[model samples]
Target: KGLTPQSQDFSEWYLEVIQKAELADYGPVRGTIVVRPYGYAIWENIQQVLDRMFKETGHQNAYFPLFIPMSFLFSPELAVVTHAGGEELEEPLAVRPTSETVIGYMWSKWIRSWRDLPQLLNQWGNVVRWEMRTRPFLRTSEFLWQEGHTAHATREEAEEEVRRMLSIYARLAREYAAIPVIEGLKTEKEKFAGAVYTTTIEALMKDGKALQAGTSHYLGENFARAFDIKFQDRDLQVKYVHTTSWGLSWRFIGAIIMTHGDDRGLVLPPRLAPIQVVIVPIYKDESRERVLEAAQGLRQALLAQGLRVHLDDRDQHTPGYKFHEWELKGVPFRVELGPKDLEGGQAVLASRLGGKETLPLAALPEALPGKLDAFHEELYRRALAFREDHTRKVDTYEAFKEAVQEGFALAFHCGDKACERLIQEETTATTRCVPFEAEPEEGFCVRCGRPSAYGKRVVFAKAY
Candidate 1:
């Protein structure tokens, strides 16, 4: 009567969509997954989003060794000082995960004069860590991502680097990922192991959960001091480099999927699809030339307009099969040029967001591009509206339990870990984030009667 597989087994539906879409599969390794091309394609889309943002804000791509002789973990003492769950020993050399220590060690060798005061370098690479719990992109023990490490001469410069990168993350999440996010500071407990403070964007997901999509950590000379990475100053003084590292991983891909995808499956934003448009050609023997020609013309026209287009002219399949394939892959726009449309000198334009129309062939250039852009914007708009509708401000504890039964509960809460634990123990919902903004007046602890107050609303949500 309800849905089906996911009606009772949420995990089954999760895995079904994952495997069906070719996003991932079981691998030989216990906590690892074989990320298929569709999965990697999504990741690459995330990379493009990050890359363009990084370049716009003065970051250049660079590569670093995957193995770091393990000593690098402790080379920068602060790196492990605030450890969450990685290496624990004073010195445990292992495969590099985030690259703050590894890159900082390299900086110790490469940095010099004041001219190199602000060295910004980034890389896209695979990292491995030992995790007790794991999931596809959300909690993968091994995942690929881009990491940016910047070394500056002064504290002010380092802070600027941190802010710039956070802005880049927020922009990409909002614009390309089609997921609006809250940009704010991480708690001391949640901040990166070696960071003075970490600023990041947290996305609200369809599951009424929160995910850390991307992060920009303010190293603040923590690694530089530990590694003794120093540079000559303009005032002719020597000081340790002020450093910052930022990155977005496959988790960003997860955010895009969870934010936009519906019961149908994964719904990728137009900007994220490597092939922006999928052209499906339909014909019935004699009319093949007209259909093929029309589809090809539309494809070429879109490609000339600087869009990625793929024409499916395989004679073995029906238009229905092509539609299912393209839709499952989440192409943003699709055009079907068939005998009817070709005969009528028109093509059928379809948007993944649930709209279709027939338009003249000559209007393909004018209408296609505009419609593509409109569909993209509309998709994002609908997602934002969904998130807003699901988000409600709750005051009483009764409201808290009731609202979470449906969606997220954005409650004004005190920044108390113990109070957070109370909610988790009681309802399994945890502190999602402490937002950045004007602080709220002292309100009783959302859990216990105490002086519970924070500058802004502290978010609480279920998580992946």
Candidate 2:
């Protein structure tokens, strides 16, 4: 009656929860999804927070064209358009898989000297990647995202920007989305193409699979040289600017869903939840008038306190039905006000996390903010505990294979691309990252028994 149990089939559970919760639906195209109002509201909240953070960090928003010239389209995954305006064009236009080339081209024109250095720009838009097998939010034909591009006079500044942006993404995932993540450096074989290095936030889903929540890449003058983005230094020497690009996509919506959802449905963090609190008036026809008036007043108080609150006043649905619906939608708090509660000058408050209490009506607005903050912390703590429980440090190939089947396997690696490929082919698990927080140690590769390469164990997992 609710969703497919996660233990029974996690994949089926995810699809079912999306449909039942009215978060999204399949689109006309095979690899596309139409995000419903509820889902888009969540995305809007995510965008609002991230946009403010970007601006706080000295990045300004900008717009870019959707199509890239074939000459600029280097990735094999690009979706190319041959004809437009009912005719074949002189050159094929490729839908942007990412905006590095076009952004670099513009930088070439805008950055002329050291004074014009440090162009920090961000673009909120959509891109197409022509993925073969896709899922809603996780991997779609097209997805919405914010791509950050910055150019610096030196490689050190660009590298700093890379780590800075990666840390921001980790904070967003951990604090706002309530998803605990591991910040790390991607292995050479897993790094972004044409990038000197890639930093990422890797999160563990409830099903023990890892998800790459976000990535920041240091291009090390690759795109700058390609697009002739050069500037004159104070020494009067012309040099290519070092550049970086980082992105966080709607794929994170999937991460939030998989990380916090349960058998009932989604368990959204209050900060990112579209509807943080839902007021359901539980009353019979005789008491409806009084209960609804109180509920409306309570809703206004919460709204005035700057919370996203909803008063469920639909006459056609019962209070139980409304409760179920709001729970499935992952509203953090549900207030039930009825004749009995009004008589006691209180309302029954139920948390989506579990447990119910009777709180005085006058104290709700002030109390709820603190409760929501606690909810976010608890959610993050639970996810972190789950990841720790599922992770194992293994020194042998047999143990490494066993560990990844459950969750993350922290194992030493030879750091050879060929060896990485062989391990992936054998176990279908790829290196997630070498976590920044892991202590360095001398060890041997778990697979080949060769000397360890990264000075730390690499995290390997089967990922989305």
Candidate 3:
């Protein structure tokens, strides 16, 4: 009941919601978490949504090894072995940090000619990393994610794929998660370790901090050449396939939490809420049967429309407590039917965002879906408005630093690595992206007095 107010401490609020909302809990081991059923259900919904997108876009699910040979972490040859019971073991295995090496190795063996050029694979699984500082879904030592690895025939094709995947990520965040994100390229210092370039979708949270919701990378020929993934082309020349890898992880769970959660608790968007509509019955003993019967009838009616609905008929808790509890759970819609309302042939409809309304019971089906769709748009609009309000275009370093602390700073950069590092060192702010949404406007570099060469203004922010 003592949920921390988000205004008081956003960090504590996030942690409290994770516990109070039954999303997750700390594991016995440091830097690990035990994802509870509710948390996992959210993750499963995320997977179902994205997996459909993946298949539609020519990707198929294929798994790679959880443990890779020590050599696969770097080279494709040589074996590091151990002794098991006085007998020599096969090869030392390191838990995979990512699947580039294994997937690339497999691609090399599978691909032979131009006919087998593009290999698109996505893996849904867990990976291990040693994290010194961990926070729930954002920085766990072990976490779940979907890693997408692809092979294309040319640099142009790979580049298109990179942008395409970034668009997909942006769509997923905006359309499904109800989080409006800025799409753009990550600076060299901020990109994946060996990527040719990385594109990302950054979503601003309630705390005015940006979260990298997802990423798509053009790996160029790095992993392809490393693993010897080659194919004969139409020109009769063997060439290394251009490779790209991207991922969206459980960290997204954190993004949704900070982006949409209110002081009550998690304010899940209708699309992502596991239990989208929960109906509560209110009545004294004399009229309990009538109220519950109406609640069940309404629940069935909603379910018939293919809504994720539940009737909370628990006698252990009072209706007021149930209302507060479900509000804390962030169910998108709540319907309450007291005996009085049942007699009146209406139900009280409350939304997590739109306050409450009273509607005729028979009018629910005709009304609920539109209301849910409007709710999604409203959440997206609310977040987008927050971002527009917080963002400022600055042309000087002092203002750049100040604006980043306030929210997002849209400023020209010379695209110099030194300038990028200096900005972070000076203000703890990084370039979130050269946003795809911005127009090409020329301006002086914020870091240096030199001509702006980064093309357009970039978003710089203090990120999570």
The most accurate candidate by TM-score is 2
Per-residue lDDT of 1-464 in model 1, one digit per residue for the tens?
A: 21224345555556666776778888997778899987888787778777877887788988777556555544432222233266455544466766667777778988887887679899999876656565787777678888888888788988988878888888878777678887778766567888998887878777667778878888887888899898877787888888888887787777776677655566777777777788898777798877777777888888888887898887788889888777766788788887876778888888778788898878777666677667678877887787787777777888888766656676766667667777888988766566775346556666675656665556666766
Instruction: State which candidate, 2 or 3, has the greater lDDT.
Output: 2
Q: What would the per-residue lDDT of candidate 3 be over residues 281-334, giving only the tens digit for each residue?
A: 888989988888888888888988888998999999998899988888889999
**lDDT tens per residue, model 2, 1-464:** 66889999999999888888898998887878899999999898889999988999999999988998898754668888889999999998999888888888888899999999789999998998888776777878799999999999999999999999998998899889999889999999999879989999999999999999999999998888889999999999999999999999999999999999999999999999999899988888798788888998999999999998998889899888999999998889999899998988899999999999999999999999999999999999999899999999999999999999999999999999999999999999999999999988779999999999988999999998
Q: How much is the lDDT of residue 340 in candidate 3?
A: 78
lDDT of 2: 0.92
Pairs clashing within candidate 2: none
**What lDDT does candidate 3 reach at residue 52?**
91
lDDT agreement of model 1 with the native: 0.75
User: What is the Å distance of residue 102 in model 3 from its true position?
Assistant: 0.5
Specify the highest-lDDT model's number. 2
TM-score order, best first, reads 2, 3, 1
